Design an enzyme around this catalytic site. Structure first.
Site, PDB file in Angstrom:
ATOM      1  N   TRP A 130      38.698  44.205  44.345  1.00 25.27           N
ATOM      2  CA  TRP A 130      39.354  43.167  44.964  1.00 25.27           C
ATOM      3  C   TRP A 130      39.983  42.238  43.520  1.00 25.27           C
ATOM      4  O   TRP A 130      39.222  41.813  42.942  1.00 25.27           O
ATOM      5  CB  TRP A 130      38.573  42.300  45.521  1.00 25.27           C
ATOM      6  N   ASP A 211      28.550  41.596  46.173  1.00 30.63           N
ATOM      7  CA  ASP A 211      29.612  41.030  46.833  1.00 30.63           C
ATOM      8  C   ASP A 211      29.744  41.385  48.535  1.00 30.63           C
ATOM      9  O   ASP A 211      29.867  42.868  48.645  1.00 30.63           O
ATOM     10  CB  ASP A 211      31.271  41.135  46.586  1.00 30.63           C
ATOM     11  N   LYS A 246      35.067  37.661  58.065  1.00 32.50           N
ATOM     12  CA  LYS A 246      35.266  38.987  58.827  1.00 32.50           C
ATOM     13  C   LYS A 246      34.619  39.108  60.202  1.00 32.50           C
ATOM     14  O   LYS A 246      34.870  39.346  61.415  1.00 32.50           O
ATOM     15  CB  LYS A 246      35.802  40.120  57.972  1.00 32.50           C
TER      16      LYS A 246
HETATM   17  C1  LIG Z   1      35.426  42.041  48.541  1.00 30.56           C
HETATM   18  C2  LIG Z   1      35.921  40.596  48.851  1.00 30.56           C
HETATM   19  N1  LIG Z   1      34.885  39.745  48.539  1.00 30.56           N
HETATM   20  C3  LIG Z   1      35.133  38.562  48.925  1.00 30.56           C
HETATM   21  C4  LIG Z   1      36.451  37.985  49.663  1.00 30.56           C
HETATM   22  C5  LIG Z   1      36.822  36.535  50.171  1.00 30.56           C
HETATM   23  O1  LIG Z   1      36.094  36.352  51.286  1.00 30.56           O
HETATM   24  P1  LIG Z   1      36.384  34.761  51.937  1.00 30.56           P
HETATM   25  O2  LIG Z   1      37.697  34.785  52.770  1.00 30.56           O
HETATM   26  O3  LIG Z   1      35.191  34.796  52.904  1.00 30.56           O
HETATM   27  O4  LIG Z   1      36.234  33.769  50.905  1.00 30.56           O
HETATM   28  C6  LIG Z   1      37.123  39.147  50.199  1.00 30.56           C
HETATM   29  C7  LIG Z   1      38.206  38.688  51.071  1.00 30.56           C
HETATM   30  N2  LIG Z   1      39.327  39.837  50.751  1.00 30.56           N
HETATM   31  C8  LIG Z   1      40.496  39.877  51.695  1.00 30.56           C
HETATM   32  C9  LIG Z   1      41.183  38.502  51.977  1.00 30.56           C
HETATM   33  C10 LIG Z   1      41.573  37.726  50.578  1.00 30.56           C
HETATM   34  O5  LIG Z   1      41.892  38.390  49.486  1.00 30.56           O
HETATM   35  O6  LIG Z   1      41.610  36.537  50.510  1.00 30.56           O
HETATM   36  C11 LIG Z   1      41.425  40.728  51.165  1.00 30.56           C
HETATM   37  O7  LIG Z   1      42.469  40.718  51.988  1.00 30.56           O
HETATM   38  O8  LIG Z   1      41.241  41.792  50.196  1.00 30.56           O
HETATM   39  C12 LIG Z   1      36.973  40.250  49.974  1.00 30.56           C
HETATM   40  O9  LIG Z   1      37.791  41.462  50.302  1.00 30.56           O
END
Ligand SMILES: Cc1ncc(COP(=O)(O)O)c(CN[C@@H](CC(=O)O)C(=O)O)c1O
Ligand SMILES: Cc1ncc(COP(=O)(O)O)c(CN[C@@H](CC(=O)O)C(=O)O)c1O
Lengths: 396, 396
Positions: A130, A211, A246
């Site tokens: 990410w 994570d 989620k």
């Molecule tokens: C692997 C991962 N960790 C942490 C988070 C962050 O979670 P919170 O929204 O609870 O803070 C996301 C959210 N990933 C989503 C949304 C984003 O990037 O904001 C994504 O679309 O990858 C995630 O995909």
């Protein structure tokens, strides 16, 4: 003072949202952000959640500050979700949980904590991962190194590569693992692979940072925690950053947790007082709403049963969308063979689309995906499956 | 990895709550933390608030992510509260507001931004001040220097001392002011003093950073913002960290705003993009609940009317308690003269009690005050007034 500040490049993920909105094309399709959608293409508030909210509305008598670490029930419920109802970490009282503003806030609280109170200098993140992982850590003053993971050609997990690259990691380095639903690949280690990773890490002296943001989206709540649990039986110290964004459809309420594990109760507590100090100098104390909801649902048998069913529904239907995508692509003229997609877990699929193909789909066709080729399967519906599959085909 | 971690000293403010919430004495009195209490000793959820919350429950159809900067109407509503309806700052599109998790969250976001996007190295904070100001800035890597402020002998604002002290600040330095209700003194500059300070600051090249956590608790909404508006008319740039915790009784929902002002819109937009990047790597995006409440209330004429009245009731009750305190102290044969207390504003009173006196008050009598002798006048009640004044008198 600000004359010379230059504009920041838009968020690869969050920024699509800007574009998408500002876009007038009538049939535009959004597959960017990882947000669950239903058959009608809407992101509804869960029923269990609306019910939990009604309850709070009637029963809340004050808005008085929560403690730095938030709601106790909340931490307690999270530990059971994570480690299992009768776990030893819990009995031995080796874990402490702080309620945070989302999984991101948990990630950040962990970073700030590590940076200020340990000898940690670098954190190892997978390739790919990410994009915001780099940003959070760098923000705390930590260096981010990458480890091999995905095998593009075979669309699989390259264990060998994974293992050799991690060989460069020093003892006392932090290694970040995705609990389940690897973002963005959707490829997760098997349990044996988890077990293998769990020993190396102990043998090599790394500090595991999990994570955990998609608990329940792969196979189930308990199944999804196996890897983590495997790690938990062996390690003396562990850090868990989890999100309820989620699995509870609570995206904008910022609900997550940072769980700290140590060898013993006395140690964890001492370490935790520093974590609290780091929170205090950041956002002071956490937002009550969303975490109240979660604790209400998890602590009430009836509301809980309803919740677990709603999550099961979210999950199976994503799975349905995976099969439908592959097929539609299939009989819509796809040159390539997208069947690997069926084997990925979670909300996304790494399509294998080039950066230019994504650009084009967006430009020519109104279809929004992330530059990396990550598509949000959970954004797909039977009503948007065709136009979307034609678009893609037209760009192969 | 955590074996060597040393335990953090407890929060001088937040930690009192724990102590307080742990002694089994029957008539203990909490005068620590800055939270409003009614005649019956509670911190109720405001009526306008419960109303907005009901509306939300009935009207919300989604919990999908808000933008990095939060709810637009929220920011809009904040600017007008801060600058007034029809400000040029507003008209010229010179300001951008990010919704944050409390005033603390905004102070921190401002720090991260400054530290990464500007040449700022030091932040000037009053002596005394809220103890967390130091913690926040320090965590962003900024150095904190102190300026003179209060005249403990005479219980006034030592203007020349304040000015002479600041002559040590350099152009390019950040100077932090409390909008109103100076914490912990309760002594605020006059409008002329505010003007003076505004002119100087422009000549000396300082970057003004306002901490506005009690708008409405000194004289009222509009008049409590004078100083700030005096600055805004002279300056090209400024940063405002505001909180809605006290004026909306929304403590635990974490609601605040960070407002960035620059010479122009092109300029302010560029800087803002950087401030968002800093939010994204911290908490990602803000908690909807509380800000949703505030915006609903500020956007609705009926609700607004009710809220403003609730706010004037809070303010006047504190004013009542302050007179009552002084009197009873008197009637209880207090050594010294405590009339200055009436001249202070906001929720607190800088009692003039020594460390050892505050310490005694607590062990011996179960009365809880902050070590600096800061007392929460808003926690005072006609029922707790006697015992409390007897305790004070006995320690002097
Ligand atoms: C692997 C991962 N960790 C942490 C988070 C962050 O979670 P919170 O929204 O609870 O803070 C996301 C959210 N990933 C989503 C949304 C984003 O990037 O904001 C994504 O679309 O990858 C995630 O995909
Ligand atoms: C001057 C000042 N600024 C900012 C804040 C932070 O406000 P938020 O709660 O909106 O983040 C406070 C809160 N001061 C209170 C409470 C506390 O210290 O936590 C006090 O008792 O001083 C404050 O007094």
């Amino acid at each position: 003072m600000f004359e010379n500040i230059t504009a920041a490049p838009a968020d690869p993920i969050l920024g699509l949202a800007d574009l998408f909105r500002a876009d007038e094309r009538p049939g535009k399709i959004n597959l960017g952000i990882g947000v669950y959608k239903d058959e009608t293409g809407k992101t509804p508030v869960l029923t269990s959640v609306k019910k939990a909210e009604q309850y709070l509305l009637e029963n809340e008598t004050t808005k008085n500050y929560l403690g730095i670490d938030g709601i106790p029930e909340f931490g307690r419920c999270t530990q059971e979700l994570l480690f299992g109802k009768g776990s030893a970490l819990i009995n031995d009282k080796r874990a402490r949980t702080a309620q945070t503003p989302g999984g991101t806030g948990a990630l950040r609280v962990a970073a700030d904590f590590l940076a200020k109170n340990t000898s940690v200098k670098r954190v190892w993140v997978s390739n790919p991962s990410w994009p915001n992982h780099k940003s959070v850590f760098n923000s705390a003053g930590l260096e981010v190194r990458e480890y091999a993971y995905y095998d593009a050609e075979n669309h699989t997990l390259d264990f060998d590569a994974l293992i050799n690259s991690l060989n460069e990691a020093q003892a006392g380095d932090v290694v970040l693992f995705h609990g389940c639903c690897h973002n963005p690949t959707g490829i997760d280690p098997t349990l044996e692979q988890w077990q293998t990773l769990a020993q190396l890490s102990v043998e090599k002296g790394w500090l595991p940072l999990f994570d955990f943001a998609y608990q329940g989206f792969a196979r189930g709540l308990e199944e999804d925690a196996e890897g983590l649990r495997a790690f938990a039986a062996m390690h003396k110290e562990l850090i868990v950053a989890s999100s309820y964004s989620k699995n509870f459809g609570l995206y904008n309420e910022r609900v997550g947790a940072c769980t700290l594990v140590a060898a013993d109760s006395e140690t964890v507590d001492r370490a935790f007082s520093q974590m609290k100090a780091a929170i205090r100098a950041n956002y002071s104390n956490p937002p009550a709403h969303g975490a109240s909801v979660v604790a209400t649902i998890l602590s009430n048998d009836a509301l809980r049963a309803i919740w677990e069913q709603e999550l099961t529904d979210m999950r199976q239907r994503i799975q349905r969308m995976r099969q439908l995508f592959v097929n539609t692509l299939q009989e819509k003229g796809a040159n390539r063979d997208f069947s690997f997609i069926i084997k990925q877990n979670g909300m996304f699929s790494f399509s294998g689309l080039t950066k230019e193909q994504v650009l084009r789909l967006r430009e020519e066709f109104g279809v929004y995906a992330v530059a990396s080729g990550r598509v949000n399967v959970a954004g797909m519906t039977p009503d948007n499956m065709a136009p979307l599959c034609e678009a893609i085909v037209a760009v192969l």
